Design a protein around this ligand. Sequence first.
Ligand SMILES: *[C@@H]1O[C@H](CO)[C@@H](O)[C@H](O)[C@H]1NC(C)=O
Ligand SMILES: *[C@@H]1O[C@H](CO)[C@@H](O)[C@H](O)[C@H]1NC(C)=O
Ligand SMILES: *[C@@H]1O[C@H](CO)[C@@H](O)[C@H](O)[C@H]1NC(C)=O
Ligand SMILES: *[C@@H]1O[C@H](CO)[C@@H](O)[C@H](O)[C@H]1NC(C)=O
Ligand SMILES: *[C@@H]1O[C@H](CO)[C@@H](O)[C@H](O)[C@H]1NC(C)=O
Lengths: 49, 121, 275, 50, 49, 331
Amino acid sequence: DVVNQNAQALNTLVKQLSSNFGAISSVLNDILSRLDKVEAEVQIDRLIT
Amino acid sequence: QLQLVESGGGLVQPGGSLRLSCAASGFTFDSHDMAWVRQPHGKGLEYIATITSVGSNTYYSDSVKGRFTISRDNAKNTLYLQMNSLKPEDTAMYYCAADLSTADWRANWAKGQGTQVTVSS
Amino acid sequence: SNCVADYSVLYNSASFSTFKCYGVSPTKLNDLCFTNVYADSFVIRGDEVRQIAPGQTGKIADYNYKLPDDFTGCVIAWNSNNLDSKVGGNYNYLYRLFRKSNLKPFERDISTEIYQAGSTPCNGVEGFNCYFPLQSYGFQPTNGVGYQPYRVVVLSFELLHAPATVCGPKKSTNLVKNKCVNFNFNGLTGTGVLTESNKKFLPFQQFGRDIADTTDAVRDPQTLEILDITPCSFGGVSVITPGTNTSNQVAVLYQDVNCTEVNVFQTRAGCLIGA
Amino acid sequence: RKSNLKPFERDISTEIYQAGSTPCNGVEGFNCYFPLQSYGFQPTNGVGYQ
Amino acid sequence: RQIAPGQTGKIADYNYKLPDDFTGCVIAWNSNNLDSKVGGNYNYLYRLF
Amino acid sequence: QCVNLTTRTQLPPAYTNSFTRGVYYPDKVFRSSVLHSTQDLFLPFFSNVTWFHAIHKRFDNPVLPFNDGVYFASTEKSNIIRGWIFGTTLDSKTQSLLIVNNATNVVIKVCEFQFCNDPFLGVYYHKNNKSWMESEFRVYSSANNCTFEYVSQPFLMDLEGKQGNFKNLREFVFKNIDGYFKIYSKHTPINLVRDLPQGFSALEPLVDLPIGINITRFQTLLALHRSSSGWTAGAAAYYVGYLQPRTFLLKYNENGTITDAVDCALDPLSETKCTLKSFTVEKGIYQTSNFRVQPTESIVRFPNITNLCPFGEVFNATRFASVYAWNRKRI
Ligand SMILES: *[C@@H]1O[C@H](CO)[C@@H](O)[C@H](O)[C@H]1NC(C)=O
Ligand SMILES: *[C@@H]1O[C@H](CO)[C@@H](O)[C@H](O)[C@H]1NC(C)=O
Ligand SMILES: *[C@@H]1O[C@H](CO)[C@@H](O)[C@H](O)[C@H]1NC(C)=O
Ligand SMILES: *[C@@H]1O[C@H](CO)[C@@H](O)[C@H](O)[C@H]1NC(C)=O
Ligand SMILES: *[C@@H]1O[C@H](CO)[C@@H](O)[C@H](O)[C@H]1NC(C)=O
């Protein structure tokens, strides 16, 4: 139960990286290579939050 | 060659009257649709007067509607425009354009040379 | 499809009244790549360019031309008054005034059925409560600017779905394997180590993704082989020190890396420089 | 304008706007300003001024 | 009357331009006695176009 | 040819059970040894699919609706199913996929067809010197506004259909989201394991078309073979299943193919498998979702007022006001 609970707590943390969080994509570099910096600030701020 | 030589320009007071001419040759005159074009200083192109092929319809831009007078010449084939009740903002190079009238969807306005008219006092 | 698009010469020309891009920025079009690019040409009224956006309503956006809410493209519109308007109004351009409901997006409607206004079935004629849905445009060059004909191209492109067919003018470089590089594989930017992979892609696929949904393996579009993107930059730095009141000699533990930087000894916690 | 304007409030006061130092007390003349200028409803103006 | 942000004209295209977030004041006064010469003050050279 | 069938008979719509068939690759991303959870229009497991078979004099080719997208299968040995008329009212107002696979090339024509009522191809003269030749080309005659045409590369021409046992099979998925035919396809001649489609095989995309039409009906084009005056319907069968917005869980294998899948909303055991994201569920008690009673209908209750508001008197007044003193009209 200790081993499984630490492993599930890590896998949840990793799988939170594939989440949009309101932004366009979970991929940071796609936002970094579609939009100007004035709007990339908005989308990246949602992902950072 | 189609030739559109313009004449009858100059200076005029606010409220005055003018008349333009457009020496039109090189084409059958009722085959081409005739219109008057102005270009203000600091602005682009602008249509102020529009008449059809047989001259049965006289059309006016809303800023010059009820004050100007477009006509035509059916013997010497020359385009005219009697401009009356003039306004100070009408300071523009008044050109002379002629549509190609090809199959009713294309519009090739054969732009002339224009005579310089300034309305100042 | 199957071409190189110079989006810059389409953009820096000042002839266009409205150049509003939606999914992207109009300056990174020249570097970002696409899969399917569609152009949608049509002529509308003057102020109706407002009704071409994801989410607008009205009479153009509602009945006869809708953009989806997840739209990723650019809208081009310019004044064509000197090339569309006629002295009696250009009757060759039309629009659907009457529609039963809203229209689904990207759906052409070439129906000529008479719009039954009241209750009487029209039986194929116009008239009393029998309104013909397809009106006309009066395109006179003497009109006001809100009624002057604008020519509109909706340039929708299908982005991040597929192998790429339309890519802008960037020269490719040679391929570098087994080295920490800063790569650009057909649109996506990354930073990793490229090795030859054992993953086998079905030919409609390009991008292998891991559990965090980052691009793990790719297909090289130049020569259609399959690579394997491994990141650089392992671990952290830990500074082993005695007291400052004892010495200023230090040791540096690079955590869980192989001795790559480079006494220098491979502890099981990582490479340990200076002890 | 004389003071802070609160919303949904008409300023229909017939007190004369004294800007300088000469007390006017209800008449016009020497520096007795009058912000209530008129509308030129002539069809001669440009479309940005309609 | 063409010293304005976003507008067009001879002042607003060839030789001068204002930003849309402009604060301050545009100050001038009657200066007929201050710059005019008898034959014309052609010493004030300017670029027209 | 506006001549209908001579030996057409009305038969009832017999059903079968789609076991696990009709699972497509949802996107063009490679995965490996993961369980990916996606939500799109799917063929639900253990559902009734209509068993349309063409047999000796007893066949109907009905006009089938197109609610959200359709599955298709084809248990042939003889290449008799060709194409699909699509559309709403089945006129020249629509476009129709045709695969006239005439044993020479994969000849595909995607046009606006000149509309037919009882369409058919056919091979004939089979007692001697047959060569699988066709003449009755009446499923397509003329085509204005041909917006598309594609010719794929030729495939393994499997003319050898062994009598009896069930091997040769195809699986297609026809859906339409925002003017896009995402036609998913899979050509699986199954090995004879036990006599029936049972196991698993995933589908994959082939084409996408920028059509942009409204579709509420479709049909299926036909041919004829026998070893239609003296001819009947040839021995094959096709299946129709409808797609619904389900949610699947998909086990990609080592090499990257979907080996096993889990429908979520089939039974509560598979809902538990979707919640735990694993195909093996250990002993215990698990919480799945909420019990959610359906809403019946909409009830609008506004007070019975019928006289209008003074909008003419405000919007088209005669004596106006100014910003010095605005007229607050009360409505
Ligand atoms: C690009 O060139 C290489 C060889 O120079 C070739 O193998 C490849 O197929 C070419 N790319 C495409 C898309 O055909
Ligand atoms: C990396 O570490 C392994 C053992 O972990 C060692 O065998 C190998 O030599 C190291 N790599 C290099 C380049 O020395
Ligand atoms: C299939 O059809 C039969 C009879 O119409 C019905 O009893 C059965 O419940 C259906 N199967 C499903 C899964 O609904
Ligand atoms: C994966 O592919 C290899 C290639 O030979 C094959 O041997 C192996 O059985 C495959 N495994 C699975 C699970 O498909
Ligand atoms: C108010 O005026 C507009 C235009 O002036 C007109 O279209 C509208 O029908 C009028 N409203 C009425 C008559 O209720």
